Structures are given as C-alpha cells and as structure tokens.
Design a protein around this ligand. Structure first.
Ligand SMILES: OC[C@H]1O[C@H](O[C@H]2[C@H](O)[C@@H](O)[C@@H](O[C@H]3[C@H](O)[C@@H](O)[C@@H](O)O[C@@H]3CO)O[C@@H]2CO)[C@H](O)[C@@H](O)[C@@H]1O
Length: 365
C-alpha cells in the first residue's frame, strides 16, 4: 500500500530494507520503484491524481510540483524539525510552506585514481597536459557525464555564470546569468576540451562510470551515490575539491535529496510515519547510506558520524563553494535550456555565444 519512487542511482535496496522495518511494525508493505524519468513522470500522473505515495528527488523539482498542487504540505512538529539542519528545511520551503522532508545534501566533487594520479590537478587548465601524459598510455585524464547540465554547471558557474539572480531570500526569473562573460568562458573551456579530443561529446553517466571504475581514466566528476560502486571496483580513489577555473573554485549546484508526499495519496499518515520515524533516523539512513552513500545527511545526530569521513568533508567543501539550487517552478526550464546549450556547443550545432543566448531566452521566457 506504500509505493515510493526514487532515482536508479540512489540506495533503493537500502530504502526497501527500511520499508521492511516498516512492514514489520505496521503490516503495510512498501514498494520502492525507480522508473526512468520519474521526475518527469510524476507531474503527469499526479495531475490526474495518480503516481506513487512518496517521490524522492533533489528539492529543485519540488517548487514546480507544489505550485501545481501535487504535493501535500507536510506537518512535522517543531521538535522533529529541530532534529534536522535549518538550511535543509529552507530547501523545501515553498511559498512559506514545507513541501517535502529533506534527506541529504549532495554536491559533486572530483574523484581521482590515486594509483594513476597521486597528486590530482588544482585547476581545469592543467587537465589538457595531463590528458596528453595519460593518452600516451591508452588512458585519459577525465571522463564525466556530459549529457546532464548538472555535471557541467560547476564549470560554467566558476567564472561567473548563474541561473536566476538571488536578491533577498528571493529570485528574479527575468535576470538569468547563463549568457554572461563567466558562462561563456566556462562553456568555451569545456568545448575546447572536446575539440582537442581530451573528452568526447557522447560520454554519459554509464560510460564515464565504467571507465573510472575500470581504471581507464584518472578522474571523474560525481556525487556521493557513486562511491559504493567505486568501493566494489578496487580503484584506489580520493574525493577532493573540484578543479578551479580562471583561478576560481568550481561552483556546483547543491541538491538536497528530498521526499515529497503526493497530494493524491490516501496514505498520508503512513507516509509521514515512514519518513519521520523510519527513514529519518540513524538506523534508517544507515540502511540507505550503506547501499549508496547519501552525502551529508539532514539528520544532525547521524551527520556527526558521517562528518568525520574525508569524502564527506570534501563533499561539504564543494557544496560551500557552490550554490543551493532554487526550488522555483522555473528550474526545469533553466535545466532544459542548459542541457540543449551544452549539447549543441559540444556537438558544433551552435557556437558558445549562440548556445548561451538561446538558453538565456529559454530560461527566462
Ligand atoms: O537536463 C534535463 C533535466 O533537467 C532537470 O534535471 C536536473 C535535476 O532536477 C537536478 O536535481 C539535477 O539532478 C541530479 C540529481 O539531483 C543528483 O542526485 C544525481 O541523480 O544526478 C542528477 C543529474 O543527472 O540536475 C538535473 C540537471 O542535469 C529536470 O528536473 C529533468 O527532468 C530533466 O530531464
């Protein structure tokens, strides 16, 4: 009776273990699913009053579901809210109402093979040279998901790109920073790495992951969820600050994996009890984190154990160098516009200037 959607890159088996712990106490079975594009499927099935009871995604998507009336306002009392970091409640704050439970805070870091690269580059600019050392050996410096703007954004933003100008605890949807000087420098650098054969326009999550995990590439760009598979692989890896660009620190967009309750769910009390009293506990999170690391968890008591982990220290350091995603409805437009921008600039279909121009138009209008 309890159906959960969570993306395929997350700890869905650990989450089902927490769902067994629930069935044990309530008699209610939990069905964890990981459909493709589920963030895209949700507004379509919830808009007809359909979908899962609970949906897990980064908080960025949630402003849009909320103002469309697809998410239940959640009702944690103040004692429960005191359990979690204040900024993680900020992330799910839409129009002044809490619209999801925050689970974990995610930032991309640089992941490097210590065997091939004992001292990883401090800069983007030294990557070309390193690539030339590695190639001679049949290996490459760096492979990461080029298809999703999330992975390329840290670089576009370094020298001054931004999504929506942040004013007073607010956001201006007419002021988009996707087509400024810093955005152009950033995307030009990425396009120049592809042009000079240091990376390939067609590299995706799976391709990049298999290459790093097999030891074919010295580095990758990835988040906490990815470290379990690296642990299984026998690559000896470090988790560090992203390269700087033009002497500036890469600025990843920071996501707070969050759990929304479908407004059409006839099981809202069950969903509440599951999220508060099973998932968001030291035991629940550890069942999930054990499956695929979550990053810096929202739950203070569990985060203090995780915080000592140097991979977590470097995750939080990249997070502090980047920006919390907006949750406003306009984010999916912003993301679709930067997706096409980067794809088209990588492939040659548009120059950097004309790609970022059209993204600016599509992000803001
Ligand atoms: O590019 C098209 C794509 O854009 C939007 O997706 C963005 C996500 O909503 C945003 O959270 C972020 O997603 C990353 C996850 O948060 C992270 O946990 C991990 O799973 O990697 C994701 C990157 O794949 O970034 C993407 C931007 O790439 C929009 O919501 C999507 O529906 C749309 O298909």
């Amino acid at each position: 009776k309890l159906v959960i959607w969570i993306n395929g890159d997350k700890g869905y088996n650990g989450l089902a273990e927490v769902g067994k712990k629930f069935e044990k106490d309530t008699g209610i079975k939990v069905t964890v699913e990981h459909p493709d594009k589920l963030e895209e499927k949700f507004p379509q099935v919830a808009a007809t009053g359909d979908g899962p009871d609970i949906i897990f995604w980064a908080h960025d998507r949630f402003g849009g579901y909320a103002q469309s009336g697809l998410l239940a306002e959640i009702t944690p009392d103040k004692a429960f809210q005191d359990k979690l970091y204040p900024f993680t409640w900020d992330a799910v704050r839409y129009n002044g109402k809490l619209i999801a439970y925050p689970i974990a805070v995610e930032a991309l870091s640089l992941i490097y093979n210590k065997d091939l690269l004992p001292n990883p580059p401090k800069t983007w600019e030294e990557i070309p040279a390193l690539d030339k050392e590695l190639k001679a050996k049949g290996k490459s410096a760096l492979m990461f998901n080029l298809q999703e703007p999330y992975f390329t954004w840290p670089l576009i933003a370094a020298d001054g790109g931004y999504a929506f100008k942040y004013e007073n605890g607010k956001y201006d949807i007419k002021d988009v920073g996707v087509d400024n000087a810093g955005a152009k420098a950033g995307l030009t650098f990425l396009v120049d790495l592809i042009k000079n054969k240091h990376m390939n326009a067609d590299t995706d999550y799976s391709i990049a992951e298999a290459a790093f995990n097999k030891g074919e590439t010295a580095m990758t760009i990835n988040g906490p969820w990815a470290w379990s598979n690296i642990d299984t692989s026998k690559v000896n890896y470090g988790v560090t600050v992203l390269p700087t660009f033009k002497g500036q620190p890469s600025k990843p967009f920071v996501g707070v994996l969050s759990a929304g309750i479908n407004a059409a769910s006839p099981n809202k009390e069950l969903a509440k009890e599951f999220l508060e009293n099973y998932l968001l506990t030291d035991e629940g999170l550890e069942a999930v984190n054990k499956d695929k690391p979550l990053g810096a968890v929202a739950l203070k008591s569990y985060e203090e154990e995780l915080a000592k982990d140097p991979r977590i220290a470097a995750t939080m350091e990249n997070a502090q160098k980047g920006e919390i995603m907006p949750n406003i409805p306009q984010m999916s437009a912003f993301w679709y516009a930067v997706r096409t921008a980067v794809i088209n600039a990588a492939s040659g279909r548009q120059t950097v200037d004309e790609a970022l121009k059209d993204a600016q138009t599509n992000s803001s209008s």
